Amino acid sequence: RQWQPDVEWAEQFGGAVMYPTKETAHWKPPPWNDVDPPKDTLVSNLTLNFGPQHPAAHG
Amino acid sequence: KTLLHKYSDIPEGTECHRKAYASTSIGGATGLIVSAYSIALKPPASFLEGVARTGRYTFTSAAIGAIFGLTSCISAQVREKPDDPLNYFIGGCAGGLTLGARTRSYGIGAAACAYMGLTAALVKMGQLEGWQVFAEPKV
Amino acid sequence: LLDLIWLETILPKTTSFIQMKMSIMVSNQKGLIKLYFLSFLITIMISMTLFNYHE
Amino acid sequence: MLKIIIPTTMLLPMTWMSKHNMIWINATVHSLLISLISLSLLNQLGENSLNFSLTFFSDSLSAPLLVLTTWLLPLMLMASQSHLSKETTTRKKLYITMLILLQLFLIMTFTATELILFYILFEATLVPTLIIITRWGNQTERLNAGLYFLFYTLAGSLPLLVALVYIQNTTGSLNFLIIHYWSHPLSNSWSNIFMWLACIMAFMVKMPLYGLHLWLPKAHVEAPIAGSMVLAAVLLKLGGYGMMRITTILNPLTNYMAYPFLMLSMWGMIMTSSICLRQTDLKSLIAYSSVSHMALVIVAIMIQTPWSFMGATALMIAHGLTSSMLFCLANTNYERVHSRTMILARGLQTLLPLMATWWLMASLTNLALPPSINLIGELFIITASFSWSNITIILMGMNMMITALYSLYMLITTQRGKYTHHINNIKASFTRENALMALHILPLLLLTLNPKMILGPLY
Amino acid sequence: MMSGRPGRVPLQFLPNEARSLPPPKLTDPRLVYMGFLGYCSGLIDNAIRRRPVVSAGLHRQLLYVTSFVFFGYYLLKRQDYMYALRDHDMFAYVKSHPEDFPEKDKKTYGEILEEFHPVR
Amino acid sequence: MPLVYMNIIMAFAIALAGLLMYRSHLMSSLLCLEGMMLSLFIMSTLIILNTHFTLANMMPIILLVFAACEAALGLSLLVMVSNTYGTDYVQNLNLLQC
Amino acid sequence: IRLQEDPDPEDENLYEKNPDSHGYDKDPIVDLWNMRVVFFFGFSIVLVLGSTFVAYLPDYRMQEWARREAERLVKYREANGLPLMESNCFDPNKIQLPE
Amino acid sequence: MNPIIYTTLIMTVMSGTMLVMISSHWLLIWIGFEMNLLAMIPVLMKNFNPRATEAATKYFLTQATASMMLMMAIIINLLYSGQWTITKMFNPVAMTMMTMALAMKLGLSPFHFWVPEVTQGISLQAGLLLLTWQKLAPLSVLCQISQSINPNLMLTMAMLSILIGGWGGLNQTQLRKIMAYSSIAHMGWMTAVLPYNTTMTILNLLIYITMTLAMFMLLIHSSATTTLSLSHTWNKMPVITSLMMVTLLSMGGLPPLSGFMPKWMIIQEMTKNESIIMPTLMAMTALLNLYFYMRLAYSSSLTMFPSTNNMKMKWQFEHTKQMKLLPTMIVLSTLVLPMTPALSSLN
Amino acid sequence: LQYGPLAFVLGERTTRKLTETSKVITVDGNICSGKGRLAREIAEKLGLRHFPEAGIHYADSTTGDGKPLDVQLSGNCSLEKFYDDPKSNDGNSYRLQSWLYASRLLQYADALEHLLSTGQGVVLERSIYSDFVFLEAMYRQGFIRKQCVEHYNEVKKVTACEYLPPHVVVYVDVPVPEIQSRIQKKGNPHEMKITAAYLQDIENAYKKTFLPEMSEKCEVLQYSAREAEDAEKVVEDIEYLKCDKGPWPDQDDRTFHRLRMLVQNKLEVLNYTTIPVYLPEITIGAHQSDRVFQKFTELPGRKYSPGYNEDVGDKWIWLK
Ligand SMILES: CCCCCCCCCCCCCCCCCC(=O)OC[C@H](COP(=O)(O)OCCN)OC(=O)CCCCCCCCCCCCCCCCC
Ligand SMILES: CCCCCCCCCCCCCCCCCC(=O)OC[C@H](COP(=O)(O)OCCN)OC(=O)CCCCCCCCCCCCCCCCC
Ligand SMILES: CCCCCCCCCCCCCCCCCC(=O)O[C@@H](COC(=O)CCCCCCCCCCCCCCC)COP(=O)(O)OC[C@H](O)CO
Ligand SMILES: Nc1nc2c(ncn2[C@@H]2O[C@H](COP(=O)(O)OP(=O)(O)OP(=O)(O)O)[C@@H](O)[C@H]2O)c(=O)[nH]1
């Protein structure tokens, strides 16, 4: 039959860079949904001490 | 283009020293531009590598201009045929040879020899007959 | 030696390798806007200067 | 023309809008009908080229090539309806579309009146061919072959485009008529040399001189049989037609600038014909043989002699039928053996006696025996080139000797000798394969009676 | 180049002076080629929408052809208008500059001396 | 051409260099943007007032009302960038390397 | 398993089903008709009929016509003692030689 | 984004471009540019992914900087000529600053850095708008000031653009990056003929614009962003990849496909202007574009690629979006060469 | 009329259609625990539209006349093989989970589309967020490789991220000894061929993993086997819990327009089910894909776009 490329041919075009080099030996391919991994917990739940010097704390 | 005016003012095959000085200055100026670009898009670890890299790039470019200018005027001087395009060919290829010396690769220099030598005849070709790269809009 | 050791090396592979080597160099930007805009500063500085584009 | 072109393009819906299995039948029938119309156009007036319209005109050089392309068109359909029988109708119909679209481009290329019009379709043959090699080609290197084939001629053809438009800005129009009537001495200057280089290198890539020939062993071998014929029977001669035509405003300069390519070609034919003696693939053997014979035509033009052009056109067309036929020969055993190594399928005369015959006159025609047009072509160039310089016969004469050595080598190694024992999937030759070869050999001998139609415009 | 020629009213597809030219003939070879595009412009429309390419929505193919031949026709009329206008001031300019286009006296090939280049 | 035109001309030039010389902070670079257009603002006023271009006196105001208006976006992209990464640093402005 | 692909298909023999096959298609009736059309329009209409056509075109390049004028031209020139073919085709009286 | 809010957001983006093309006052031109910038960042911000925030950021800083430098090209010209009309510019450095700034809006010199990066983060449809609609307004100004432009400036800029655009495209595997890289390459053809007769620029603009709508919108229907993702499309949509391949050679510009329409006339024009080394380099390095074009063609339709088992699911269902205006974009992108003299209408 | 952008403009909202019973209450449980029955019991009581558990031919049901076609043409996988010999080298083990998860994804999408087009909620058996427990069960028993785990998780990440976690999950708890009791009573010889470790591996992941990480974004209903008979109890249990958790009590009309836009494009919803990850078990070569596609093309109904196939009787094709 006519030869058809397999995944070994596909991996040649499968990298994030068509011609891998030492500089691009670590460039991960983009996420498939284009949504990069969300950053870890970055909340800013500040802790406040409303007293006992605060007059509203009632002493 | 005052710097390029220096090379054009000096008649090729005559005043070999001044033509050589103009040639290396052109190479050094081009070496400055490429090194400045190189340090920008590819920053080094620190300034010590920064000055080292721009030193290498400028030295190669300045050297290539130096020999090519020297060879061009000296070859036309010894052969007394300044108009001959070959008077730039033996310089252009020789400049490519120096490129191999700086990169320590006989293959790269030989590839540079073939390409630079051809272009060196071509730039002499252009100044000879009528050729203009950036022609003024006439029509 | 002549057909597919040198002739394919002289014109084809040399041109492919030349395009090969520099396409690496013109496609490996690091995405730093600092480096990008610094190159913009170089071009805007050089263009208005020594190449005599000012006159 | 507005006479053969419409039937060719109206054949395009005919393949598309036709029955399921009747596509081959209908396409073959009317393709032969198109050829029969083309046979008329062969006759030419003495001196004035036959002019049909402002856009199209045919001289006594385009006409011998034009009929060949039309007559070729049925042959690929015949030669390719075997391995593609196991394919879907849509892709099958698409293949017929690609071939006739290709043949349409040659029809309007050879008959183009304007050099720019000539260039547009001269390159436009690239697209349908690249589809043929890459899509239906049966191999892995076909991908590399396509890139090699496309970029080689395109990189050479771009200077032609820049050169041709420059002539437009300088000498007004560019049609093949006024150029020859308003010819001027191309003044010897460095710019004109580079103009000469641009106006020639584009065509010389098409008919591959030594050095710029690495796409033949890649494209021709990996291409399918239908593609293999056209890349060696018409498109190689496409450079020839341009070379004859464009060598009209370059002739104070051809004499001085012929030397670099002449020595490259003259040494190339000895070089290329020598490559055959140690080849391994049958298809590469024929393809490399095409380089040597075509390299002879390179010399044929660049001498620029009435005899030189006279044998040039005779050689090219005789080359086309012979090399296409040999490519069918390689295809027949390849389908039956599923390999292209020569030594694998030794001793085939004893098994297939008619294929032994069809190969016999195939290799005999490549021998350029008299009076076969291959001889009347090569022998004509020998005399003209010998008048150019006496040492030419030392090279080209030896080429004929080397041409014989490998041409019988393929016949002897495959057909002659003891049959190969382990091979047992060899069947009697189909009437298609035998009929396809007859329509290749009989026309070649039929023209031998009258070389007046094959000797070109300088006749 | 016309750009700001002395009188070109902007955003005028077909200036009133263009009607003084021969209008394109109804079966114009260029115009029918525009009709060819219209047939094609509906041919894929069935193809990319996965419909019988030869026969699926003849109205869509009919509309595609009809629209193209009109917009082509108006494009063709302007195309001839500009080319005639391009040549017009060209014809007038040379007479406006007679000394600058001094048609040379014609010397027959009998007296012309051009060297000859033998081939060998 | 007096020094008042020149002094603010190089005021823009050092501002133009400043925006083109990102140190670590895009906020700092952003602050360089509106100072840079202020040099445009003052030059626009200086020329127009000097030449008594009466109808052109509107232009310097409307120069502000767009440069300041786009400065809202300049913060707005910044105010959103500082959320996911946690800072305005342009060092992290390379997630789109590929 | 690497993947799920069918193995190499068996190279079918067109003769195995119908030995009378002409190597043109699978279906017997079209094979005969394919054989008819390839031959009939291959040799008779084009090869045979076209050869008689191409053999019988009118005077190509006015060949025999060119010969005919030679005879009277030959008879003209030698009878009145003038060299039967003049050295300069373009009569020098017409042209002018500068300097 | 609320569809009505999206609808008007595009309405202003076109309006800002329209304002540039229909005004003679320099200040009104800057408004047209700023307003266009003012309401295209949200278009990039439709999906709101951190990658999009990355690209939408990168675009703004370059485009905002370009407007500011452009704005001094207005005032310096005012400072040295006392004029506000778009005419033959009356100061050398002012013209240099504007050309240096307008080019950055398009991206020819290393200004091209943002174009690929910006295209990558932002969505495909928003990419289409960026590569085809914006690139009209900066060219609109150039066609009007071309008479006063330093000829030896953009030619280097255009040569640099076509060289770098073609050079990098070889190494790109993300179809968005290839598309943007090719746009930079074709934009070099745009600016190269600009100092000469600008009618050829408009023809190149119109031909290229219609040519990239076809390229993009087929990509949208494929819903593919990587070469492998486009490779798989042969299974579900075998014809779509086929039209993709037809666009690809017109993308490259081989006759008789009308992708060779712009290049041909550029060479013809620029040869009439005694410039013959300049066209030769352009035609030469234009082949570099064709290389990765074939690579993408080889993966798409010229060969076949290993599909996936789950792709059998997509066979049952049909596409919903009606690929508006696409069927004539492809036709008007390939087989238009025979109707060449229509360029006279453009001028 | 479709939610095409004109729909949101002229007045077609979605909050009007959603009401008190407009929630996706998925029903799950241990294997063979009768969750399909219990899912049906909650269905007719409240008025919740029931989606039968997607298998291999659920996508078959959606298209054409349903008519579950050839396995090699409609999934290339059979769970009975996985029952008999789960270590088959042809990769049919993983081809289940990949195709099943895609089948679950289509069912999940059609759940939201119906919910956002009528306002009636959906009760779905084994939602997409309960597909992974089967996979690691085939991973722990060696039925699939660790790369098969990564690909499915990657597909899950790039697909289920834009799929909100259901309001209330229901699990009837059945331990392994009771599971063995039901299977031997069932009879179908394939499903006898199971290992107790697999049944043990189903339950603990359903308990130690499924219930906790979803309880944060949903209202979990941990239920024993007794409540399976008392289907009445769940009716007021779900009606009592406020459902004030998860993304649902946060969005507006514009988000729901975005959700209905994506689900309406059926190709989009599973466009990421075929990520170019060349995994040997799941990848299909060129020749097989082409011929199978050819076989699918000639299958009646799918030759052209729906409503454009003359083979079925779509008259006026020349004018449609
Ligand atoms: C007739 C008048 C003139 C007479 C004198 C002759 C001309 C001037 C002298 C020769 C100029 C051309 C030769 C090259 C000069 C620059 C060399 C240079 O930068 O070398 C460093 C480097 C090459 O090495 P690299 O690839 O970095 O590998 C090592 C990595 N660690 O560089 C690079 O990596 C950069 C990329 C490769 C080089 C790009 C091209 C640079 C030169 C452009 C043309 C300059 C033409 C000057 C003359 C005409 C214009 C005035
Ligand atoms: C310039 C040079 C050429 C440039 C373009 C070259 C294009 C092809 C190059 C190779 C492409 C890659 C390899 C092949 C890819 C094939 C793509 C494909 O989808 O193939 C399979 C597909 C299956 O067919 P299907 O979609 O079912 O449609 C059948 C027709 N209804 O097949 C199809 O969909 C095929 C669709 C065929 C449609 C035929 C329409 C015929 C219309 C005839 C009109 C006749 C009018 C006559 C009028 C006479 C009076 C004037
Ligand atoms: C792959 C490399 C190329 C393969 C081989 C191709 C053939 C080699 C030569 C290529 C020549 C390309 C340009 C030729 C176009 C037509 C030129 C022509 O007709 O002649 C002109 C010759 O003029 C030239 O300068 C033509 C170009 C000469 C060579 C310089 C550029 C070509 C070499 C580098 C580019 C191509 C190589 C590839 C680079 C990647 C006459 O004009 P002129 O110069 O006399 O103009 C009037 C007046 O004197 C003012 O000029
Ligand atoms: N891989 C995989 N298998 C699944 C999935 N959903 C169901 N199955 C299989 O479906 C088969 C039958 O499940 P059971 O729970 O035993 O079905 P049942 O006997 O009808 O019992 P109920 O589900 O409680 O109604 C088992 O082999 C499961 O592994 C899924 O998402 N992925």
Enumerate the domain spans of chain F: 3-92
Q: CA Rg, chain E, in Å?
A: 25
CA distances (Å), origin B139, targets B130, D60, D118, H193, H221: 18, 40, 27, 12, 45
Q: Are H237 and D102 in contact (CB under 8 A)?
A: no
Listed in sequence order, the residues at least 6 apart from I239 whose beta carbon sits closer than 8 Å to its beta carbon are: I46
> Helix or strand or coil: residue D178?
helix
Q: Distance between CA H140 and CA H102 in Å, rounded?
A: 10
Residue bearing tokens 């094979």: G31
Residues of A in contact with I278 (CB under 8 A): 7, 10-11, 14
**Two tokens, residue I90:** 């042809």
Q: H272–B139: do the CB atoms touch at under 8 Å?
A: yes
Q: In I30-87, at which residue ranges do the beta strands (DSSP E only) sit?
A: 49-51
Task: Report the residue of F28, F77, F94 to disrupt the C interface, i.e. the one with the largest count of C CBs within 10 Å.
Answer: F94
Q: Do the annotations mark residue I30 as ligand-binding?
A: yes
Q: A3–D136: do the CB atoms touch at under 8 Å?
A: no
Q: Are D375 and D368 in contact (CB under 8 A)?
A: yes
Return the closest-CA partner of residue D181 out of D297, D48, D346.
D48
Q: Count CB pairs under 8 A between chains A and H.
A: 56
Q: Distance between CA D162 and CA D157 in Å, rounded?
A: 9
Q: Distance between CA I295 and CA F7 in Å, rounded?
A: 79
Q: Are D230 and D102 in contact (CB under 8 A)?
A: yes
Q: Distance between CA D203 and CA D122 in Å, rounded?
A: 10
Return the closest-CA partner of residue D348 out of D423, D435, D438.
D423
Q: Distance between CA D327 and CA D223 in Å, rounded?
A: 11
Q: Distance between CA E27 and CA E75 in Å, rounded?
A: 15
CA distances (Å), origin D95, targets D108, D133, G93: 20, 11, 66
Residues of G in contact with I90 (CB under 8 A): 1, 4
Listed in sequence order, the residues at least 6 apart from C42 whose beta carbon sits closer than 8 Å to its beta carbon are: B36, B37, B40, H110
Return the closest-CA partner of residue H291 out of D98, C20, D203, D221.
C20
Strand partners, D51: D57
> Helix or strand or coil: residue A17?
strand
Entry resolution (Å): 3.7
Q: Which of the 8 DSSP states describes residue D14?
A: H
* Closest-CA residue of chain H to F92: H54
H-helix or E-strand spanning residue E33? helix E29-48
Listed in sequence order, the residues at least 6 apart from E76 whose beta carbon sits closer than 8 Å to its beta carbon are: E24, E28, E30, E31, E34
Q: Is ligand 3 within 6 A of the CB of residue H284?
A: yes
Q: Are D214 and D156 in contact (CB under 8 A)?
A: no
Q: Are E46 and E53 in contact (CB under 8 A)?
A: yes
**Two tokens, residue E56:** 């699926």
Listed in sequence order, the residues at least 6 apart from F45 whose beta carbon sits closer than 8 Å to its beta carbon are: F60
Q: Are H309 and G3 in contact (CB under 8 A)?
A: no
Listed in sequence order, the residues at least 6 apart from H285 whose beta carbon sits closer than 8 Å to its beta carbon are: H162, H163, H166, H167
**Two tokens, residue I66:** 């349903």
* Chain C partners (3+ C-beta pairs within 8 A): A, B, D, F, H
> Helix or strand or coil: residue I49?
strand
CA–centroid distance for B117 within its chain: 10
Listed in sequence order, the residues at least 6 apart from E90 whose beta carbon sits closer than 8 Å to its beta carbon are: none
> Helix or strand or coil: residue F25?
strand
Residue bearing tokens 């090869």: G47
Shortest distance between the Cα of D89 and any Cα of chain A, in A, equals 17
Q: Are D31 and D77 in contact (CB under 8 A)?
A: yes
Angle formed at CA B124 by CA B118 and CA B128, multiple of 5 degrees:
140
Say whether domain F3-92 belongs to CATH 1.10.3080.10: no
**Two tokens, residue B131:** 């050729």
Q: Is ligand 1 within 6 A of the CB of residue B34?
A: yes
* Closest-CA residue of chain F to A28: F98
Q: Distance between CA D80 and CA F87 in Å, rounded?
A: 66
Q: Are H67 and H97 in contact (CB under 8 A)?
A: no
Q: Are A21 and C27 in contact (CB under 8 A)?
A: no
> Helix or strand or coil: residue I17?
coil
Q: Distance between CA H70 and CA D240 in Å, rounded?
A: 55
Return the closest-CA partner of residue H307 out of C38, I14, I277, D185.
I277
Kindly tell me the sign of the dihedral angle through the C-alpha atoms of F40, F43, F47, F49: positive
Q: Distance between CA I275 and CA H314 in Å, rounded?
A: 13
Half-sphere exposure of E28 (CA within 13 A, CB side): 18
Residue type, position D134, single letter: T
Q: Is ligand 4 within 6 A of the CB of residue I126?
A: yes
Listed in sequence order, the residues at least 6 apart from H210 whose beta carbon sits closer than 8 Å to its beta carbon are: H329, H332, H333
* Closest-CA residue of chain G to A8: G2
Q: B131–D189: do the CB atoms touch at under 8 Å?
A: no
Q: Distance between CA C33 and CA F92 in Å, rounded?
A: 10
CA distances (Å), origin H190, targets H142, H183, H266, H277: 11, 10, 9, 17
Q: Distance between CA I71 and CA I69 in Å, rounded?
A: 6
Q: Do the annotations mark residue I36 as ligand-binding?
A: yes
Listed in sequence order, the residues at least 6 apart from A39 whose beta carbon sits closer than 8 Å to its beta carbon are: F84, F85, F86, H50
Q: D123–H283: do the CB atoms touch at under 8 Å?
A: no
CA–centroid distance for I18 within its chain: 22
Enumerate chain F positions whose Cβ falls within 8 A of a Cβ in C.
Answer: 16-17, 19-23, 26, 90-91, 93-97
Distance E57 CA to ligand 2 centre (A): 18
Strand I168-172 relative to strand I25-29: parallel, antiparallel, unpaired? parallel
Q: Distance between CA C8 and CA C11 in Å, rounded?
A: 6
CB atoms within 10 A of CB H234: 25
Q: CA Rg, chain F, in Å?
A: 17
Q: C37–F21: do the CB atoms touch at under 8 Å?
A: yes
Q: Is ligand 2 within 6 A of the CB of residue D89?
A: no
Return the closest-CA partner of residue D65 out of D441, D372, D459, D457.
D457
Strand H307-308 relative to strand I283-284: parallel, antiparallel, unpaired? antiparallel
Residue B125's φ and ψ, nearest 5 degrees, are: -60, -45
Q: Which of the 8 DSSP states describes residue D280?
A: -
CA–centroid distance for H246 within its chain: 19
Half-sphere exposure of I310 (CA within 13 A, CB side): 11
Q: Which atom, in ligand 4's list, is nearest to the CA of I35?
A: 24
Q: Distance between CA F59 and CA H26 in Å, rounded?
A: 11
Q: Are D430 and G24 in contact (CB under 8 A)?
A: yes
Q: E119–D304: do the CB atoms touch at under 8 Å?
A: yes
Q: Compute the residue count for chain D.
A: 459
Angle between helices D142-171 and D115-124 (to 10 degrees): 170
H-helix or E-strand spanning residue I123? strand I122-124
Q: Do the annotations mark residue I4 as ligand-binding?
A: no
Strand partners, H174: H226
Listed in sequence order, the residues at least 6 apart from E105 whose beta carbon sits closer than 8 Å to its beta carbon are: none
Return the closest-CA partner of residue E52 out of H59, H228, I159, I310.
I310
Return the closest-CA partner of residue H334 out of D100, D152, E43, E63.
E43
CB atoms within 10 A of CB D428: 13
Of the candidates G11, G27, G50, which has its C-beta nearest D425's C-beta? G11
CA distances (Å), origin D378, targets B83, F15, G13: 43, 77, 42
Half-sphere exposure of H42 (CA within 13 A, CB side): 19
Q: Distance between CA H106 and CA B27 in Å, rounded?
A: 31
Angle between helices D235-246 and D306-337 (to 10 degrees): 170
**Two tokens, residue H227:** 């070469």
Q: Which of the 8 DSSP states describes residue D367?
A: T
Q: Do the annotations mark residue I11 as ligand-binding?
A: no
**Two tokens, residue H202:** 């408009």
* Closest-CA residue of chain H to D116: H264
Strand D50-51 relative to strand D57-58: parallel, antiparallel, unpaired? antiparallel
Q: Is ligand 3 within 6 A of the CB of residue B137?
A: no
Residues 30-59 of E with CB under 8 A from D: 54
Residue D125's φ and ψ, nearest 5 degrees, are: -65, -15
Q: Are H96 and C53 in contact (CB under 8 A)?
A: yes
Angle between helices D115-124 and D126-136 (to 10 degrees): 10
Largest separation between any pair of C-alpha atoms in chain C: 55
Residue I95's φ and ψ, nearest 5 degrees, are: -60, -25
Return the closest-CA partner of residue F44 out of H30, H39, H35, C45.
H30
Distance D94 CA to ligand 2 centre (A): 6
H-helix or E-strand spanning residue E76? helix E58-96
Q: Are A10 and H228 in contact (CB under 8 A)?
A: yes
Return the closest-CA partner of residue H247 out of H335, H131, H325.
H335
Q: Distance between CA D270 and CA D264 in Å, rounded?
A: 10
Strand partners, I25: I168
Scored b (16 or more CB within 10 A) or e, D276-286 reads beebebbbbbb
Q: Are E43 and E53 in contact (CB under 8 A)?
A: yes
Q: Are D125 and D235 in contact (CB under 8 A)?
A: yes
Q: With 0-12 CB in 10 A as exposed, 13-18 as middle and 19+ as buried, what is I142?
A: exposed
Q: Do the annotations mark residue I131 as ligand-binding?
A: yes
Q: Distance between CA D404 and CA D421 in Å, rounded?
A: 29
CB atoms within 10 A of CB C15: 13
